[PDB]
Design an enzyme around this catalytic site. Structure first.
Site, mmCIF file in Angstrom:
data_model
loop_
_atom_site.group_PDB
_atom_site.id
_atom_site.type_symbol
_atom_site.label_atom_id
_atom_site.label_comp_id
_atom_site.label_asym_id
_atom_site.label_seq_id
_atom_site.Cartn_x
_atom_site.Cartn_y
_atom_site.Cartn_z
ATOM 1 N N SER A 17 13.081 45.850 16.602
ATOM 2 C CA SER A 17 13.304 44.428 16.380
ATOM 3 C C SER A 17 14.637 44.159 15.693
ATOM 4 O O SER A 17 15.651 43.926 16.356
ATOM 5 C CB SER A 17 12.160 43.835 15.553
ATOM 6 O OG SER A 17 12.287 42.422 15.440
ATOM 7 N N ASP A 38 16.691 37.681 17.331
ATOM 8 C CA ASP A 38 16.659 39.058 16.861
ATOM 9 C C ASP A 38 16.768 40.001 18.062
ATOM 10 O O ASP A 38 16.916 39.565 19.210
ATOM 11 C CB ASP A 38 15.422 39.323 15.994
ATOM 12 C CG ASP A 38 14.110 39.240 16.755
ATOM 13 O OD1 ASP A 38 14.065 38.675 17.864
ATOM 14 O OD2 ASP A 38 13.113 39.726 16.184
HETATM 15 MG MG LIG Z 1 11.540 40.751 16.787
#
Ligand SMILES: [Mg+2]
Ligand SMILES: C[C@]1(O)O[C@H](COP(=O)(O)O)[C@@H](O)[C@H](O)[C@H]1O
Length: 448
Positions: free
Chosen positions: A97, A237
């Protein structure tokens, strides 16, 4: 001891000491034993080690007789979407992430992309992997490569009436994660002019880790919006299940206000629906949902709680202040793409700027933002706060930590389920002065 990489909701670890190809293969074997019948969807993000971890996962799954559907380099939400769309037994996204470059991880789901979390299978997997000294078997099932994104792209576009869209100028900032690929595939079907910042996927992250909450990363999006006169900017992200918004002045929008905005946008299409929200910041969402003819549903924060509450309620939309937005038609899963499409449509249809859409909500319900406190004794710190305010007789709710409603102001104070911190959110009824004095008062008590 236990394998540190197995967290409450996913797997996250430094490569290779906490997470490596052998652990990944063992995770695949263990996951096979946990799922109902069916194939398993695998996808991965742009991190350098992610392909090899997915290949190990696939080897363990196929050794255990599981057909693997490899959807390739993708966003986390594409694993969710394809797991549901292809009626798979489950799916795994290989991703870290927004974490440093030496980290990786996995997000695991079962049928209909339902989450696999510590108490719903993930720790069973952990304990199986921890005890597994068996020789790696050989593959008894196949892998198919299925990188076609057409169904996913069509699904994203189905949330907006494209004949109502205006040719807005939008800054998009993938942070050298994976979002740019999807933007570019949507672009031929949209009238927007995109201004692309940090667009190319690059697991070396020459412009910094893909975390749009870092002020220096925020500033790249803001500068591009201001310098190009863009209608708004969007940053994601690395695995783009979170998106972040910048208005035409370059101002970063606090995610709290997006929950009410997206609820109103959704409730226009789907009248009378339920909307799930978390307990950290509430008043604005409750009001906006109700004024749009929806029904707000309070829920513990965290994607597993939100998704299960949305399912039990047939809720059309769920949103957290921390940039997580969930959609019933998207298998109750979160998307970092659907939200900006809905906002672009709202701006196009309303003739209002994103700034003005949220400005009166910010004036009506000013909030502190989430403030984190690393303290020596969280339980004693919370007690210090509650003893201080006890004589005011607040209305108390224990859905998720402690919520205290004083009338014109309220706070929520939580221990995090992913970090050993206390997290504070305060909001008031149109009173910025009260917001600051109470926030500072609580801050002093917590640090005391
Ligand atoms: Mg993420
Ligand atoms: C993983 C995760 O991103 O972590 C966030 C913070 O969780 P917490 O530390 O308990 O405030 C959650 O809100 C979110 O739903 C979840 O998907």
């Amino acid at each position: 001891m236990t394998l540190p990489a197995f967290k409450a909701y996913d797997i996250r670890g430094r490569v290779p000491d906490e997470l490596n190809e052998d652990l990944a293969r063992r995770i695949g074997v263990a996951l096979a034993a946990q799922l109902d019948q069916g194939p398993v969807v695998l996808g991965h993000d742009v991190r350098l080690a992610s392909p090899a971890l997915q290949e190990a996962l696939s080897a363990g799954l196929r050794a255990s007789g599981r057909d693997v559907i490899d959807i390739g380099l993708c966003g986390t939400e594409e694993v969710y979407f394809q797991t549901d769309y292809l009626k798979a037994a489950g799916g795994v996204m290989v991703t870290a992430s927004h974490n440093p470059m030496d980290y990786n991880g996995m997000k695991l789901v079962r049928e209909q992309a339902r989450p696999i979390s510590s108490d719903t299978g993930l720790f069973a997997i952990r304990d199986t992997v921890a005890a597994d000294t068996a020789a790696p078997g050989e593959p008894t099932a196949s892998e198919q490569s299925r990188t076609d994104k057409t169904a996913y792209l069509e699904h994203l576009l189905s949330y907006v009436d494209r004949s109502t869209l205006k040719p807005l100028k939008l800054v998009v900032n993938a942070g050298n994660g994976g979002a740019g690929l999807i933007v570019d595939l949507l672009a031929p079907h949209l009238p927007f002019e995109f201004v692309r910042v940090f667009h190319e996927p690059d697991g070396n992250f020459p412009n910094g880790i893909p975390n749009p909450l870092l002020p220096e990363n925020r500033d790249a999006t803001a500068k591009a919006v201001k310098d190009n006169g863009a209608d708004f900017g969007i940053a994601w992200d690395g695995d783009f299940d979170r998106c972040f918004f910048f208005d035409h002045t370059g101002r970063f929008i606090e995610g709290y206000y997006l929950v009410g905005l997206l609820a109103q946008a959704i409730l226009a299409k789907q009248p009378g629906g339920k909307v799930v929200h978390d307990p950290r910041l509430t008043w604005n969402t409750v009001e906006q949902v109700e004024e749009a003819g929806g029904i707000p549903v309070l829920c513990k924060s965290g994607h597993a709680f939100i998704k299960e509450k949305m399912r039990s309620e047939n809720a059309v939309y769920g949103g957290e202040m921390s940039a997580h937005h969930y959609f019933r038609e998207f298998a109750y899963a979160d998307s970092g793409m659907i939200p900006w499409l809905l906002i672009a449509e709202l701006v196009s249809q309303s003739g209002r700027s994103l700034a003005d859409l949220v400005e009166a909500r910010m004036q009506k319900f000013p909030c502190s933002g989430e403030i984190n406190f690393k303290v020596a004794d969280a339980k004693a710190s919370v007690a210090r706060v509650m003893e201080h305010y006890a004589s005011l007789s607040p209305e108390l709710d224990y859905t998720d930590g402690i919520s205290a409603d004083f009338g014109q102001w309220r706070f929520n104070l939580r221990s995090s389920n992913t970090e050993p911190l206390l997290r504070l959110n305060v909001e008031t009824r149109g009173d910025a002065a009260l917001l600051e004095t109470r926030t500072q008062e609580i801050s002093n008590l917590l640090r005391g």
